[PDB]
RNA sequence: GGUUUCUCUUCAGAUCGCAUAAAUCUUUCGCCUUUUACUAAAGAUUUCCGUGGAGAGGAACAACCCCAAUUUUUUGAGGCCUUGCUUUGGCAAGGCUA
C-alpha cells in the first residue's frame, strides 16, 4: 500500500549488511521487487563497522563506488548517511 | 520469459568449467538446455589434487555450474 | 458566449458537403506555384508582371561589356517567369528579392465514388502493380522442425475491431480539407471576417473569361497581396469601453428588439 | 525489469569486476550482460581470496552465482527513479 | 541584430565502438530532415527555409538508446536530396561510414536514390534502407494491405536490384528480415523493423522469444492458429501473410479508428491496446492526435537504432576498408597502419572536406573527422592541401586550433578534446584551406600524405561569368568568390584572359 | 446587476417624441443634438447585426 | 561536341501532352514513358541539350500548373549537328539559327567571347 | 473541491486577427489655374474594429486461487579432525563420514 519500503530513504546514504556480511554504505541507487540494489559512493565494511571507535573507526573498508547488488545476497538494511548534495 | 542459454558462441567448443564443490572439469560444449545445464562432450575432470578422469560426455550441473571459461580463442 | 466549438466528424462531414460549391477543389500547393505571395512580392520588387497576375508601381523606378550581342549565344527567349523563378541568377540589382521555390510533394488522394465500396479499397486510377524483377532473393528463413511456436494467448493486436466502419471514408476524405473543415474544434469568428470568395480569386488561369472578369481578377489579387505586404502588427494597445461606459450610468436603459425595429429607430433619430 | 539489470545491460563496453559466489574477483570489458545477469565476457583478469592469480583470453559467468558488480565511473553521471 | 551530460557522452566519444557515423541520403522531399527533427526532439526537448527546400548538409550527434537499452553516439550527415547537390552528399559520404537511403513509400526508387546507391557502392560503404511514409498508403492512396505489402516488397526487391548492378559479389542483399530495412512515416512518429514490432509484441504479451518471432514475419509466410506454427502456403483458405496480419492489419486498423471514430470507439481501442490518452489529448485535431497515438504506442525510434548497430561497420572496425580507397598510400608502412588502427595514437591524421561558415564574418570552421589520433586545443598542427605532394611543403601552411566544437543540428558544444573516430568542427585552421584539406601534427615530424580529393558524380557543365559594377570593386569581388569556394565543394573558378571571372556549376 | 426593460418602454418613448416640433420636449432638443456625433457609431453597430437571408 | 541532360518528370496522365510539346520546343528527345505502378502518375525520361535546358523546369511546371515537376543531370556529350570549320556560314546577330548551324554559331560566339 | 455567466480591476501582439479600415507626417510621382477633395510608390507614427494575460466580488448549477532445483520469505553447503601460519584468538589446506 505504501511501497516507498526503499523510495523514501532512496537518495540517502544506508549500509546494508549482505548475506555474506559486507557492510556496504552508499547512496542507494535503486531497490528491486528482487532486492536489486545499487549504491553511489560506495564504501564495504568487513573487520568493523565504526560507531564512535577511538582507536579505529575507517578499517577493513574496501572502495566500491558504483556498488551494483542483486537480491540473493541481500541480508540487512540500515540508514547511515544523508544524501550527497552533488 | 524463458530466456535461453547465450552458449551457442561457447557451443562446438571445449571449455574449462568450475562446477561447485571444488569440481573442475574440461569438455567439448555441444549444447544446453533453457535451464543452462549443458551436455558437453570429452569430460576430463582434473581433481584438486590433479587426478585426471576422463568420463566421457555428461552434463552440467545448472543450478550448480559455477564458471566455465573457453579453452581456445573466439 | 459563443466561443470555442467542438465538433464531431459525422458533423464536420456533413458541413463539407454542404459547403461542396463554395469551395476550392484541389488537396495541395503545387497549383499556386509562380502565383503565391513571395512570387507576387519578387515581381513586385522588381517591377514584372506574371501573365495573370497584379501590376504596381515600380519600386523605385551607363556602358557594359557583358550585353556586347556578338558575344551571346540566344537560343530559347528569357521570359519572365524565368527571371522570377531565379531571381538571382536572372537578375541585375534584386533589392528585396524574396526567394520563390517549392516542389511539394504532389499529394495523391483519390475521392471515393460510391459509399459502397470498402473504405480501403483497390481503385482503377492507381496504376496496377504487376511487380516484376530479378531472382528475388533468398534469406535466413528460419525452416521450421527446429521448433517454434506461439505462445497461445497472442492474437493479431486488433482483432474484433474491423478493417473500417461507416466513417472511415469520410475521417480520410477530412484530411485533405480546406481551412475550417480540416479541424474538429476552434474559435469562433466574427461574420465579418469570413472572406467567402477569397479562394475563387487567388486562382490562376481561367481560359475564355470576358477582359472584364480578367481585369477584375487581378485586381483582386494586386489587393490581396498588398494586405499581405502591409501587415503592420498590433503594435500598440489600450482597450476603452464605450458601451460599458455607457450603460454603467442612468441615462442609458437596456433591452430587446427585432432587428428592422432598432433600423427603423435609427432611421428616425439620424433624420 | 530491473533497473541495476538495466545498469548492467548498459555496463557492456566499459569495464566491469565480479565477485563470484567463492569471493573472486575478475575484471574485464564487459560485452554482453543477459536479464539473468549470466555475463559472458572476454579477457578476464581473475584473482582469488588467497592471493592467487588467473587470467583468460574469454570468461562466462553465471548469474546466481554472482557476489558483486563494480563497473568504472562512467554511470556516476539515469536519475529520475 | 550539458553539464552533467557531456561528460558521458565523452565517456561514449573515448569509447570508440559505441559510435556509428552514418549519411542519410535519398530524393528529393523524401523525409531526411523531418525524421532527424523529431529525432532531435525525441532526445531533447530542449534560404533554405524560405524556399523550403535543403541546399547545404547537416551533421547531428546524439545520443540513443537501442532495443536492449545501451546508450550509442551517433553522428549523421543529414544531405540534401535535390540532384543538383550531390556533392555535399559526397562530402559526408567520404567522412562517414555507412549510409541510410530513404526512400519514400508512394513513390519508390527515383533518380537521385538511384544515383546515391551506386555512388555508395563505388565508395564501398555499407547499405541500409527506411521505407518511409508509409502512411501515403493509407490515408492517402487507400490501399488494401495486401496491395500495400505487393508495394512494399516491390520497392524492397528493387533497390536489391540495383545494388545487383554495382556490388559484384552479393554477400548482402535486402530485406526487412535481417536489420537492413526500417519501415517508417517519420511525420506520425512510426519506425519500426519486423524485431522491434515483435519485441512490442512479446513485451506486452506472453514470453514468445521475440527474434524467433522476428525471423518469421517478411515473405510469404502464413500461419494457421490450430498449427500456432508458421508454414509456407498450405492455406487454400486464402489466407493473408504473416506480414499482413500481425503488423499491417493492426497498423491500418490503428489509423483507421484514429482517423474515423476518434469520438465513437477510440477510447475502448486504446484500452485494448493499453494507451492512456487524458482528456485534452481527446481533444486535439487528428493530425497531432495520430501522432500521439503512434508514438505512445511504438516507442521512439528503436527500428533505426537496431539497423545501424547492426549493420553500420563502426569506424574502429572502420577505417581499415576506409584508408584504402581514402588515402594515397592507403597502406604500406608507417601510416597506413597507424590509421587503421584507430587508436587514439600519435600520428593526429584527419581529413576535413566541409568549411561550415561563421554566419557573421569571415572566419569558417573546418569540419571532418580525425582518424588516428587526439586532438585538444591550443595544439599547433599541419594542414597539407591537395596541391601538397611528399616533396611539396610549401602548401603546409602550419597554425593552430582555436576552439572545438561537436554539432547539434544548429547548437555548437565547445569542448577541450577529441579522440579518433568522431567527427569535428575545428576553428582556426580555415584560412590556408581550399575543398579538401588533411591535417597532422604541427613541427612534429613523421610524415605525411594526403588522401585523394574528393571525386565527384557529376560534372559541372554550365557556365556563369561575374564581373562588379564599379570596376573599382574588384578585391572584395575576388574576396568575395574566394568565400564561395570555401563553402561549396564542387564549384569551380577560373579567370578567363579576356577579363573575366567565371563561375561553374551544376 | 442591471436589469432590461419591457421593449414597449422604448418603443412608447419614441413614439412620443415623434419628430421633435412638438414644444413639450424642447430641452431634449440639446441633448438629442449631442448625440450626434455618436450616430456613425449606432450605423456600424446595426449594420454589422444584418439578420442572413435564411432567418426571417 | 555539347553536354546532354537526362530529364526525369514525374507527373499526371494529363500532362503527358504538355510535357511532349514542351519537349518539342527544347529539341527533347523523349526516351520513355512510363507508368509508376503503385500511383496514379507517370515517369517520363528523355535527353536534352544543357543550352535549352534554360527554364525548361519553370516551363514544365508553368504550362501544367505544378502538376509536373522535372529533375535533370548531366549524362553524355553528343556532337553538335553543325560543321565548326564553315566560312560559308554567316550568323544573323540576335536570332536563333535553326539546326545545321549550331556548331558554327557556338563556336563563333565562344571564340569573340574569350578566344578571338 | 468543478464548469458556466455577470460586474469590477490590472498586463500584452514580433510574423496576426487563416481578417484587414482610416487619419497624420516625410520624400518622390501624377492630376492642374487656387485651396480642399484626390492619384501611387517608399517610410514612419497614430486612431478605430476585434483578441490574449492576471486577479477580485457576486451569481447559478453539479457535489459535501495456487508455486518456487541459478539470483532472496521451504533450500539437503552438514559436522569433526590432522597439518600448518598466528602473541593466543583466529585463519589456509586435505580427509572422513551417514
Ligand atoms: N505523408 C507524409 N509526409 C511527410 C512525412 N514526413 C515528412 N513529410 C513531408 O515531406 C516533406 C519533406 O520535408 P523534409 O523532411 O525536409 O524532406 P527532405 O528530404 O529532408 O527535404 P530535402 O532534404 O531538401 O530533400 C515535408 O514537408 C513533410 O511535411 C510522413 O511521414 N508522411
Ligand atoms: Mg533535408
Ligand atoms: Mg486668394
Known amino acids: 500500500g505504501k511501497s516507498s519500503k526503499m523510495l523514501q530513504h532512496i537518495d540517502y546514504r544506508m549500509r546494508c549488511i549482505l548475506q555474506d556480511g559486507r557492510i556496504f554504505i552508499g547512496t542507494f541507487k535503486a531497490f528491486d521487487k528482487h532486492m536489486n540494489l545499487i549504491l553511489c559512493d560506495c564504501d564495504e565494511f568487513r573487520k568493523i563497522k565504526p560507531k564512535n571507535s577511538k582507536q579505529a573507526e575507517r578499517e577493513e573498508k574496501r572502495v566500491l563506488g558504483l556498488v551494483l547488488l542483486r537480491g540473493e545476497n541481500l541480508v540487512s538494511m540500515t540508514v547511515e548517511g544523508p544524501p550527497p548534495k552533488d | 520469459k524463458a530466456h535461453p542459454p547465450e552458449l551457442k558462441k561457447f557451443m562446438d567448443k571445449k571449455l574449462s568449467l568450475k562446477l561447485n564443490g571444488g569440481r573442475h572439469v574440461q569438455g567439448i560444449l555441444r549444447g544446453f538446455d533453457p535451464f543452462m545445464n549443458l551436455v558437453i562432450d570429452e569430460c576430463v575432470e582434473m581433481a584438486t589434487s590433479g587426478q585426471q578422469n576422463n568420463i566421457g560426455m555428461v552434463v552440467i550441473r545448472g543450478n550448480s555450474i559455477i564458471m566455465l571459461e573457453a579453452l581456445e580463442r573466439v | 458566449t459563443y466561443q470555442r466549438w467542438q465538433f464531431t466528424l459525422p458533423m464536420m462531414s456533413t458541413l463539407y458537403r454542404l459547403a461542396n460549391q463554395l ?144 466513417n472511415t471514408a469520410n475521417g480520410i476524405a477530412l484530411l485533405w480539407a480546406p481551412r475550417p473543415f480540416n479541424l474538429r474544434s476552434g474559435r469562433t469568428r466574427r461574420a465579418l471576417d469570413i472572406p467567402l470568395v477569397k479562394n475563387w480569386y487567388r486562382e490562376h488561369c481561367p481560359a475564355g473569361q470576358p477582359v472584364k472578369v480578367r481585369v477584375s481578377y487581378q485586381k483582386l489579387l494586386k489587393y490581396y497581396v498588398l494586405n499581405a505586404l502591409k501587415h503592420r502588427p498590433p503594435k500598440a494597445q489600450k482597450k476603452r469601453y464605450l458601451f460599458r461606459s455607457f450603460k454603467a450610468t442612468k441615462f442609458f436603459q437596456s433591452t430587446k428588439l427585432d432587428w428592422v425595429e432598432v433600423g427603423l429607430q435609427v432611421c428616425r433619430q439620424g433624420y | 525489469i530491473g533497473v541495476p539489470i538495466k545498469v548492467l545491460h548498459e555496463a557492456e563496453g566499459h569495464i566491469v569486476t565480479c565477485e563470484t559466489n567463492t569471493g573472486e574477483v575478475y575484471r574485464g570489458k564487459l560485452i554482453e550482460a543477459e536479464d539473468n545477469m549470466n555475463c559472458q565476457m572476454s579477457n578476464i583478469t581473475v584473482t582469488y581470496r588467497d592471493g592467487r592469480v588467473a587470467q583468460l583470453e574469454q570468461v562466462y559467468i553465471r548469474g546466481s552465482k554472482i557476489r558483486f558488480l563494480i563497473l568504472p565511473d562512467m554511470l556516476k553521471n539515469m536519475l529520475k527513479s | 541584430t550539458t553539464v552533467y551530460e557531456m561528460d558521458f557522452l565523452a565517456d561514449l566519444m573515448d569509447n570508440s565502438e559505441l559510435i556509428r557515423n552514418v549519411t542519410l541520403c535519398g530524393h528529393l522531399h523524401h523525409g531526411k530532415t523531418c525524421f532527424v527533427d523529431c529525432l532531435i526532439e525525441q532526445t531533447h526537448p530542449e534560404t533554405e527555409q524560405e524556399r523550403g527546400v535543403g541546399i547545404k548538409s547537416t551533421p547531428v550527434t546524439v545520443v540513443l538508446p537501442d532495443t536492449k537499452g545501451k546508450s550509442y553516439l551517433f553522428n549523421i550527415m543529414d544531405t540534401p536530396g535535390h540532384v543538383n547537390f550531390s556533392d555535399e552528399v559526397t562530402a559526408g559520404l567520404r567522412i562517414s561510414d555507412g549510409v541510410v537511403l530513404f526512400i519514400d513509400a508512394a513513390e519508390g526508387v527515383m533518380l537521385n536514390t538511384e544515383r546515391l546507391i551506386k555512388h555508395a557502392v563505388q565508395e564501398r560503404l555499407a547499405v541500409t534502407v527506411c521505407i518511409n511514409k508509409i502512411d501515403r498508403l493509407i490515408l492517402e492512396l487507400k490501399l488494401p494491405p495486401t496491395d500495400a505489402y505487393y508495394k512494399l516488397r516491390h520497392i524492397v526487391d528493387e533497390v536489391n536490384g540495383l545494388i545487383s548492378m554495382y556490388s559484384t559479389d552479393e554477400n548482402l542483399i535486402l530485406s526487412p528480415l535481417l536489420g537492413n530495412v526500417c519501415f517508417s512515416s517519420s511525420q506520425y512518429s512510426i519506425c519500426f523493423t519486423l524485431g522491434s514490432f515483435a519485441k512490442i509484441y512479446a513485451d506486452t504479451f506472453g514470453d514468445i522469444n521475440y527474434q524467433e518471432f522476428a525471423k518469421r514475419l517478411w515473405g510469404d509466410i502464413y500461419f494457421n492458429p490450430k498449427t500456432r506454427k508458421f508454414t509456407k502456403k498450405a492455406p487454400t483458405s486464402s489466407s493473408q501473410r504473416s506480414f499482413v496480419e500481425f503488423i499491417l492489419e493492426p497498423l491500418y486498423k490503428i489509423l483507421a479508428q484514429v482517423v474515423g471514430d476518434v469520438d465513437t470507439s477510440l477510447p475502448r481501442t486504446l484500452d485494448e491496446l ?92 573546418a569540419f571532418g573527422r580525425v582518424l588516428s589520433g587526439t586532438i585538444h586545443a591550443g595544439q599547433p598542427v599541419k594542414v597539407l592541401g591537395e596541391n601538397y605532394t611528399l616533396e611539396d611543403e610549401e602548401d603546409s601552411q602550419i597554425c593552430t586550433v582555436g576552439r572545438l566544437w561537436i554539432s547539434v543540428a544548429r547548437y555548437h558544444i565547445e569542448v577541450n578534446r577529441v579522440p579518433a573516430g568522431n567527427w569535428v568542427l575545428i576553428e582556426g585552421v580555415d584560412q590556408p584551406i581550399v575543398k579538401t584539406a588533411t591535417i597532422t601534427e604541427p613541427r612534429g615530424n613523421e610524415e605525411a600524405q594526403i588522401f585523394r580529393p574528393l571525386k565527384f558524380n557529376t560534372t559541372s557543365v554550365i557556365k556563369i561569368a561575374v564581373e562588379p559594377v564599379n570596376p573599382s570593386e574588384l578585391p572584395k569581388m575576388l574576396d568575395g568568390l574566394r568565400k564561395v569556394n570555401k563553402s561549396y565543394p564542387s564549384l569551380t573558378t577560373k579567370v578567363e584572359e579576356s577579363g573575366e571571372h567565371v563561375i561553374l556549376g551544376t | 446587476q442591471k436589469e432590461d426593460m419591457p421593449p414597449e418602454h422604448v418603443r412608447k418613448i419614441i413614439r412620443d417624441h415623434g419628430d421633435m416640433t412638438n414644444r413639450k420636449f424642447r430641452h431634449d432638443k440639446r441633448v438629442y443634438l449631442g448625440a450626434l456625433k455618436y450616430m456613425p457609431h449606432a450605423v456600424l453597430k446595426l449594420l454589422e447585426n444584418m439578420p442572413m437571408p435564411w432567418e426571417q | 561536341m555539347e553536354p546532354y541532360y537526362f530529364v526525369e518528370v514525374q507527373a499526371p496522365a494529363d500532362c503527358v501532352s504538355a510535357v511532349y510539346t514542351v519537349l518539342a520546343r527544347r529539341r527533347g528527345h523523349v526516351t520513355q514513358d512510363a507508368p509508376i505502378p503503385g500511383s496514379p502518375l507517370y515517369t517520363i525520361k528523355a535527353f536534352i541539350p544543357a543550352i535549352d535546358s534554360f527554364g525548361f523546369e519553370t516551363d514544365l511546371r508553368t504550362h501544367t500548373q505544378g502538376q509536373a515537376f522535372s529533375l535533370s543531370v548531366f549524362h553524355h556529350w553528343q556532337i553538335v549537328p553543325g560543321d565548326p570549320l564553315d566560312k560559308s556560314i554567316v550568323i544573323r546577330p540576335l536570332e536563333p539559327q535553326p539546326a545545321p548551324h549550331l556548331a558554327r554559331e557556338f563556336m563563333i560566339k565562344t571564340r569573340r567571347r574569350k578566344g578571338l
Open chain 3, 23 to 166: 469551395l476550392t477543389d484541389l488537396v495541395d500547393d503545387n497549383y499556386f506555384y509562380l502565383f503565391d505571395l513571395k512570387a507576387f512580392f519578387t515581381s513586385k520588387a522588381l517591377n514584372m508582371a506574371i501573365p495573370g497576375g497584379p501590376k504596381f508601381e515600380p519600386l523605385v523606378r551607363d556602358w557594359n561589356e557583358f550585353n556586347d550581342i556578338n558575344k551571346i549565344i540566344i537560343r530559347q527567349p528569357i521570359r519572365t517567369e524565368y527571371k522570377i523563378a531565379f531571381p538571382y541568377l536572372y537578375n541585375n540589382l534584386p533589392h528585396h528579392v524574396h526567394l520563390t521555390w517549392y516542389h511539394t510533394p504532389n499529394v495523391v488522394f483519390i475521392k471515393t465514388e460510391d459509399p459502397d465500396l470498402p473504405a480501403f479499397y483497390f481503385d482503377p486510377l492507381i496504376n496496377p502493380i504487376s511487380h516484376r524483377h530479378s531472382v528475388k532473393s533468398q534469406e535466413p528463413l528460419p525452416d521450421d522442425d527446429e521448433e517454434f511456436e506461439l505462445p497461445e494467448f497472442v492474437e493479431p493486436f486488433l482483432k474484433d475491431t474491423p478493417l473500417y466502419t461507416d
Open chain 5, 274 to 365: 493499453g494507451i492512456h490518452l487524458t482528456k485534452e489529448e481527446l481533444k486535439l485535431n487528428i493530425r497531432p492526435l495520430l501522432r500521439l497515438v503512434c508514438k505512445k504506442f511504438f516507442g521512439e525510434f528503436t527500428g533505426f537504432v537496431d539497423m545501424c548497430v547492426q549493420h553500420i561497420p563502426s569506424p574502429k572496425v572502420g577505417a581499415k576498408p576506409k584508408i584504402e580507397h581514402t588515402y594515397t598510400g592507403g597502406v604500406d608502412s608507417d601510416l597506413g597502419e597507424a590509421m587503421s588502427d584507430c587508436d587514439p595514437d600519435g600520428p593526429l591524421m584527419c581529413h576535413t572536406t566541409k568549411m561550415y561558415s561563421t554566419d557573421d564574418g569571415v572566419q569558417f570552421h
